[PDB]
Design a protein around this ligand. Structure first.
Ligand SMILES: [Zn+2]
Ligand SMILES: [Zn+2]
Ligand SMILES: [Zn+2]
Lengths: 114, 151, 65, 129, 1023, 51
């Protein structure tokens, strides 16, 4: 799923398979340098793409004044009552309806979902 | 109706609401909220019709059926009703908010254009713009309707 | 442009009352109090004085031929 | 006995190829340039000047590349030569506009495919501002 | 201390009063022209390419500086006499000022001796001057002086007089430049569009747009399906779509990793990485930069014959044609690539759905072009042609070896006639150029009513072409709140395309971004050229007019410092707007013109910065050297644009933010001064528009313009083709606070009437009304009509010429049967002569090779008396005259009367005072309207206005018509009326005039304001 | 009309050197019994997968 660059020309390492050692190794084409891949995975594709939005939410949204704030749900690792919440901004998840909470503390930046 | 809409919003917020098999969650929520607001206008509007006395001039027009309609009296006395745009509620022109005053991702009655004030009482500043948006669609449809129908 | 001679509704003279109306306004009298002094009991005549603008003042600024 | 709506006209014009208003301006400009400087000849006729302004005012394209692209794009289809210049000159906004203005197109063009052709002309035509 | 809620209502209107006193209603017209005539005109001359002539003798001509003088009139004598704006209209000549340019020429004849000569104030041409502008003759003049010049002090100006016709440059909305937009179209062969039109400062080169598209997954193929979705970018001068990856290789980033560094900022995220992989496959075979340059040049518009030429053409296209705004030199490869990568990055977010698609109708994405920006583009058309004329003229001179005089080289006609042509006809741009001119600009100013004139000057136009066609300009968007009036829009097919600017809203004049650019450098801001790509992952991006200035480590501190500078009127001007996309870690700063923004009170810690002391100074705004500008200086109020409004919280009134039982929002940044300012000029005059229906408010906007009344004060001196003036235009009984700023109170367009809503004799249908004949005999709605006739005797032909004289039956061969005794010995009818039917009012004959009569008769058969006669000399010097025929129209059964809201109603019948239904006190209603109109094509505001009018007249106080004032209520008005011996609901017992028995139903009668529309039966029938 | 997209959750291309490897740990339990029958295993099998 990831992308790796070789050390010679810093170019794409397309997946290549050898018939002698029977090991998948990421090999560059223009340069003869080739490196083995330990993941043994070429790529993945989530058709439903139900990726958690917590990683996508940025912690710097706490200072936003337009975002609504609710004190009902406090931060897990802070205890601060104030917590900014909002709905998913991703168009893919627009079909679903959910709330994502972020701690209002200046430096915490914790994101959690109920 | 306003409290019921909040309850529906809370159910969807907590994922308690279950979508119908023939619709998705986002569309199902828009359907449930529309019926609550639509039913309130009809129920309050119907009560307004019974409110008018025989001597009342508003009742005389509708009773004879000459001019006006029971809906017109409802918007004058009971409530104007929801201001739908393009067949749906007011869209989020700004970032997830209909207007700057409303908080982000606000799906409440006032935020989405539900006009709870009758013409006699007077509309709030937010409702006025939402009413204008609904009226603008009708004027555009009327302008093109005559051109197409005449053809 | 100028104050009408008489009320359009009934016909009571209102042009002559305009001169006294302005004089009463600068005499610390209220807008409605001045109308009562002039003797405008009907609201039709009070309209001709309360909500009238005398545009001829600005026209007289321009010099004539 | 001739009618443009029914695609009936003198047989001589069949061999002729239609030209765009903007394209004709280029041809007139070429004619204007040589007469003005190449040869010492009487000033151009008033008729030539009148059509030059008409083409310039209604010119829908800037350069030859835009004119050629539209000409090539419409040539791939079965559009008749009479409609070739008529459609480009008129620049119908929508498919319904063209069929009413051009009865011939309704005969062999659908409401969807032609719309994909007029909008292409829109992407090619440009305004002064 | 603080503004108590009981005092906020008066305090809020005081600050608005100062805003209009300082800025005004046409500040947006004047400011843009001032910027255009002060800097843009200089920039065009300064930025002109050097003029080079060759055929040994080298001539280099450069324009040093531009000098502009005040308007003057050049007669046959040539003296520079001042030219008053009023004189231009009367003489039917353009109101304009001379243009002078300094030209310095350096000539070298291969003799190793360089000498130059100075040309001081070369008569390059002339520039039309907007009225009341900096260069206008009526700038900074007191009201007393304006009257001396026969100009209305209340007239705001802001238009151009061309050939005696007043023209207003209608603002044309255009897509914002130097901005990245991602739209989704289902008709294109590709799924997404990376549209981003990029342009330099105000204008250096024609706008160039590049679409970084992404191929759709619908297509299927052997290799296409494997890689799937790949990004293709179309260059402006490349016909075919070339992969975006190759473009970076042409820039110089041969390494593939560098390509991913500029596009993908977060390497940890693998979702975006997989999307860029297919794009690399197409560009993989192209490894060397030279090959990439060769690849791009292969499909160029004019490919070079030799191989090396292809690289050069591609190098020039990418360096200059592509992304001009980010860099125009040859050492901006790093900067250009970063912006190019951002466009791909923006596409990736939209494709994955993590970023919302840009809204087509968002006004933040649209820029407004005023007279300044519009004329700036036009000025280049003539100036560019001006250089060609000089070059062509000198070309024949240079090859012959003799020096060419500049006096002949510079063409005045192109500069003068070029601007005058489009401004008069309305077809923008030069007619010679083979293109389609944009019509509808510079329309005839509507002087029927003062409100109409104000609305026309602030008028807006929706974009035309692909941009407008794809979007829905007609539909009302949310961004219009406080910027464009929602109610006001013409009715018909062109509904919503034409709008009006909001009263408080104004369009940014424009400023140089250099002070802002220098500010960032001294702070923690670091440019892209200094940092590595890895530092962009966490930092926030900074944009100045769409340019990649560089990321910033800490966004909060910089913005707070930036906000302080904006409030303090520091190097950052209050006009400049800063937008912070928190969800995207993007800070956008815009300084270019065309940005619509409105003032807003600043709120800090749930507390207004506007204190009592600020209002106290405003209350004494006069003689205290205090104005609106001071408020912005103190930082109490700033300006928010559409983009910033997206991230700026607003509050309707202080009562909403002061305290609430349940806190809707505990963080309010800005507070609206008063919501009613959203209304436009025509919508503002409407009481209780909230109580009114939206179509009715829109319908009034059209009717209000058509209403007849005193449009200006100096109507007698001027000559207009159509001008309707009301006999007794009185201020309404129910007036809105914003009405004061529009000056509609001074110049109203209607007469109030005691309207009884009843069905009398059945002579009034839904679209009809019954008047009082006796009232009309007293001057109820009578108005005058002015029609100006113009004619000039010109010597067009040497043999045949026109003259002014009496067309005698003997000397004249061809003539039309008419009475000619009206004409005087000079062929002009003197003022004070009654004219009726077909009559000659000006004598003109042509001496054909015996003379043929070609005089001008009355347009219609109406009976009128000539008011005044004017004899002048036109611009050509020939004798030219104008005469204004004045006629008196009495309201009749065919005239159309319309209320302040609803549908116009024709006067079904006129009844004498006796026949009208009199009340107990003997008050016959002046007008009776059909009750069946109130339900649908009317509004309850009519009944409320009647109730307010009755209370206002009875209590002798002008009622308040604020749309959103909680103090005014229907119940409150009813209670006040009951105190004066009247029904609380306004109903009264009306005795029928014919039969004295009391009417069973009690009629509702009140002093409702009414206006007379221009539509009159006399004009139609007399035609 | 339903496509594989509406009924599928996720897809990936894993690498398995020998047929018995089945690098994926979770599926190793059930693939083993099914793969015991030499169905299409009469010769070499490519080490790619489209799980
Ligand atoms: Zn390599
Ligand atoms: Zn925390
Ligand atoms: Zn009266």
């Amino acid at each position: 799923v990831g992308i790796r660059f070789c050390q010679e020309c810093n170019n794409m390492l397309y997946p290549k398979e050898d018939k002698e050692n029977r090991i998948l190794l990421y090999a560059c084409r223009n340069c003869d340098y080739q490196q083995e891949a330990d993941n043994s995975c070429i790529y993945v594709n989530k058709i439903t793409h139900e990726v958690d939005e917590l990683t996508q939410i940025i912690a710097d949204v706490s200072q936003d004044p337009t975002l609504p704030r609710t004190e009902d749900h406090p931060c897990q690792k802070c205890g601060h009552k104030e917590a900014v919440f909002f709905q998913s901004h991703s168009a893919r998840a627009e079909d679903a309806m959910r709330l994502y909470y972020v701690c209002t503390a200046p430096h915490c930046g914790h994101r959690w979902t109920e | 109706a306003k409290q019921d809409v909040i309850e529906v919003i809370e159910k969807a917020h907590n994922n308690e609401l279950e979508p119908t098999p023939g619709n998705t969650l986002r569309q199902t929520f828009e359907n449930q909220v529309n019926r609550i607001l639509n039913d309130a206008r009809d129920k309050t509007g119907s009560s307004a019709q019974k409110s008018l006395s025989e001597y009342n001039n508003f009742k005389s027009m509708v009773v004879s059926g000459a001019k006006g309609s029971k809906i017109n009296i409802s918007q004058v006395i009971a409530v104007v009703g929801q201001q739908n745009v393009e067949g749906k509620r007011i869209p989020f022109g700004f970032k997830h908010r209909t207007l700057p005053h409303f908080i982000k991702d606000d799906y409440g009655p006032e935020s989405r254009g539900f006009v709870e004030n009758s013409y006699l009482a007077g509309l709030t500043p937010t409702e006025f713009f939402f009413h204008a948006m609904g009226g603008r669609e009708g004027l555009i449809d009327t302008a093109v309707k005559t051109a197409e129908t005449g053809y | 442009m100028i104050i009408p001679v008489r009320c359009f509704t009934c016909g009571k003279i209102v042009g002559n009352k305009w001169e006294a109306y302005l004089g009463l306004l600068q005499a610390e009298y209220t807008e409605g109090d001045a109308l009562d002094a002039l003797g405008l009991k009907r609201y039709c005549c009070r309209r001709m004085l309360l909500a009238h603008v005398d545009l001829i003042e600005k026209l007289l600024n321009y010099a004539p031929l | 006995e001739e009618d443009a709506s029914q695609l009936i006209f003198p047989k001589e014009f069949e061999t002729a190829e239609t030209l765009l208003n903007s394209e004709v301006h280029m041809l007139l400009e070429h004619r204007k340039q040589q007469n003005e400087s190449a040869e010492d000849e009487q000033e151009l006729s008033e008729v030539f000047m009148k059509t030059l302004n008409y083409t310039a005012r209604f010119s829908r394209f800037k350069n030859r590349e835009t004119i050629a692209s539209v000409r090539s794009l419409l040539l791939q289809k079965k559009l008749h030569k009479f409609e070739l210049a008529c459609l480009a000159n008129l620049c119908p906004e929508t498919a319904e506009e063209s069929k009413a203005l051009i009865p011939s197109l309704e005969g062999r063009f659908e409401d969807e495919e032609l719309q994909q052709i007029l909008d292409d002309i829109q992407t090619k035509r440009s305004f002064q501002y | 201390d603080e503004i108590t809620p009981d005092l906020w209502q008066e305090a809020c209107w005081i600050v608005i009063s100062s805003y209009f006193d300082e800025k005004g209603l046409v500040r947006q017209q004047l400011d843009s022209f001032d910027e255009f005539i002060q800097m843009s005109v200089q920039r065009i001359v300064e930025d002109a390419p050097p003029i080079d002539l060759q055929a040994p003798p080298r001539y280099l001509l450069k324009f040093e500086q531009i000098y502009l003088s005040k308007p003057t009139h050049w007669e046959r004598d040539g003296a520079p006499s001042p030219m008053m704006p009023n004189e231009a209209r009367l003489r039917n000549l353009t109101y304009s000022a001379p243009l002078y340019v300094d030209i310095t020429k350096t000539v070298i004849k291969e003799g190793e001796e360089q000498l130059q000569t100075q040309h001081q104030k070369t008569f390059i041409g002339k520039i039309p001057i907007m009225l009341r502008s900096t260069y206008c003759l009526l700038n900074g003049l007191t009201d007393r002086d304006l009257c001396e010049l026969n100009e209305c002090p209340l007239d705001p100006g802001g238009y151009f007089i061309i050939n005696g016709s007043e023209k207003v440059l209608i603002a044309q909305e255009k897509m914002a430049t130097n901005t990245v937009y991602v739209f989704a179209k289902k008709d294109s062969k590709y799924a997404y569009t990376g549209e981003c039109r990029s342009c330099l400062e105000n204008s250096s080169r024609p706008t160039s747009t590049i679409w970084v598209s992404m191929l759709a997954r619908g297509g299927q193929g052997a290799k296409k399906s494997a890689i799937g979705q790949r990004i293709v970018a179309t260059l402006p001068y490349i016909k075919q779509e070339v992969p975006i990856i190759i473009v970076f290789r042409a820039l110089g980033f041969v390494s593939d990793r560098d390509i991913l560094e500029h596009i993908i900022y977060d390497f940890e995220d693998p979702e975006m990485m997989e999307m860029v992989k297919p794009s690399l496959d197409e560009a993989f075979v192209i490894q060397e930069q030279n090959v990439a340059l060769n690849f791009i040049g292969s499909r160029g518009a004019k490919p070079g014959v030799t191989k090396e030429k292809r690289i050069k053409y591609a190098k020039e296209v990418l360096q200059k044609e592509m992304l001009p705004h980010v860099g125009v030199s040859d050492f901006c490869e790093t900067k250009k690539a970063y912006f190019l990568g951002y466009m791909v990055h923006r596409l990736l977010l939209a494709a994955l759905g993590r970023r919302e698609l840009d809204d087509r109708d968002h006004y933040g994405n649209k820029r407004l072009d005023l007279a300044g920006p519009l004329l700036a583009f036009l000025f280049r058309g003539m100036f560019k042609n001006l250089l060609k004329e000089v070059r062509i003229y000198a070309q024949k001179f240079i090859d012959r070896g003799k020096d060419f005089n500049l006096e002949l080289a510079i063409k005045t006609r192109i500069i003068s006639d070029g601007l005058k042509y489009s401004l008069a006809t309305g077809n923008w741009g030069d007619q010679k150029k083979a293109h389609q001119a944009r019509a509808g600009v510079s329309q005839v100013l509507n002087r029927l009513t003062f409100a109409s004139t104000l609305s026309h000057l602030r008028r807006l136009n929706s974009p035309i072409g692909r941009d407008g066609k794809l979007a829905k300009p007609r539909q009302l968007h949310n961004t219009l709140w406080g910027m464009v009036c929602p109610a006001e829009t013409p009715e018909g097919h062109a509904v919503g395309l034409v709008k009006n600017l909001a009263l408080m809203a104004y369009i940014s004049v424009g400023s140089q971004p250099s002070p802002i650019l220098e500010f960032l450098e001294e702070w923690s801001m670091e440019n892209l050229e200094e940092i590595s790509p890895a530092a962009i992952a966490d930092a926030t991006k900074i944009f100045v007019n769409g340019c990649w200035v560089g990321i910033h480590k800490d966004p909060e501190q910089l913005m707070n410092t930036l906000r302080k500078l904006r409030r303090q009127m520091d190097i950052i001007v209050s006009e400049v707007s800063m937008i912070r996309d928190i969800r995207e870690r993007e800070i956008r700063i815009y300084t270019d013109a065309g940005r619509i923004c409105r003032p807003l009170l600043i709120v800090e810690k749930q507390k207004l910065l506007l204190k009592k002391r600020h209002i106290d100074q405003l209350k004494e705004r006069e003689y205290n050297n205090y104005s609106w500008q001071d408020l912005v200086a103190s930082g109490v109020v700033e300006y928010i644009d559409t983009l910033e409004e997206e991230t700026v919280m607003l509050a309707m009134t202080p009562d909403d933010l002061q305290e609430k039982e349940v806190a809707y929002c505990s963080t309010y940044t800005h507070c609206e001064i008063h919501p009613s300012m959203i209304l436009g000029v025509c919508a503002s005059i409407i009481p209780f528009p909230d109580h009114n229906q939206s179509p009715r408010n829109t319908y009034q906007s059209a009717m209000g313009k058509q209403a007849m009344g005193v449009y200006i004060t100096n109507f007698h001196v001027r000559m207009d083709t159509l001008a309707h003036v009301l006999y007794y235009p009185q201020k309404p009984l129910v007036t809105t606070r914003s009405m004061e700023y529009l000056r509609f109170r001074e110049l109203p367009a209607g007469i109030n009437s005691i309207v009884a809503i009843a069905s009398y004799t059945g002579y009034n249908q839904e679209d009809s009304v019954i008047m009082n004949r006796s009232a009309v005999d007293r001057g109820f709605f009578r108005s005058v009509f002015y029609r100006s006739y113009k004619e000039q005797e010109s010597k067009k032909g040497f043999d045949q010429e026109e003259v002014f004289e009496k067309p005698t039956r003997e000397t004249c061969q061809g003539m039309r049967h008419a009475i000619y005794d009206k004409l005087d010995d000079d062929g002009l009818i003197a003022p004070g002569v009654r004219v009726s039917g077909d009559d000659v009012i000006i004598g003109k004959t042509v001496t054909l090779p015996t003379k043929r009569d070609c005089s001008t008769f009355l347009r219609t058969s109406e009976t009128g008396i000539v008011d005044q006669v004017m004899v002048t000399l036109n611009q050509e010097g020939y004798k030219f005259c104008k005469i204004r025929v004045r006629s008196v129209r009495i309201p009749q059964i065919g005239d159309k009367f319309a209320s302040r809201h609803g549908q116009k109603g024709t006067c079904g019948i006129q009844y004498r005072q006796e026949d009208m239904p009199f009340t107990c006190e003997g008050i016959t209603p002046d007008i009776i309207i059909n009750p069946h109109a109130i339900p649908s094509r009317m509004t309850i505001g009519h009944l409320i206005e009647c109730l307010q009018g009755k209370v206002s007249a009875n209590k002798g106080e002008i009622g308040d018509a604020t749309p959103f004032n909680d103090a005014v209520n229907v119940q409150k008005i009813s209670n006040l009326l009951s105190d004066y011996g009247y029904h609380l609901r306004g109903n009264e017992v009306l005795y029928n005039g014919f039969t004295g028995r009391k009417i069973t139903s009690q009629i509702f009668i009140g002093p409702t304001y009414y206006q007379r529309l221009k539509h009159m039966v006399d004009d139609k029938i007399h035609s | 009309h339903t496509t594989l997209r509406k009924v599928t959750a996720n897809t990936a291309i894993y690498y398995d050197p020998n047929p018995q490897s089945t690098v994926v740990a979770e599926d190793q339990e059930w693939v083993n019994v099914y793969y015991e029958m030499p169905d299409f295993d009469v010769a070499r099998i490519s080490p790619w997968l489209l799980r």
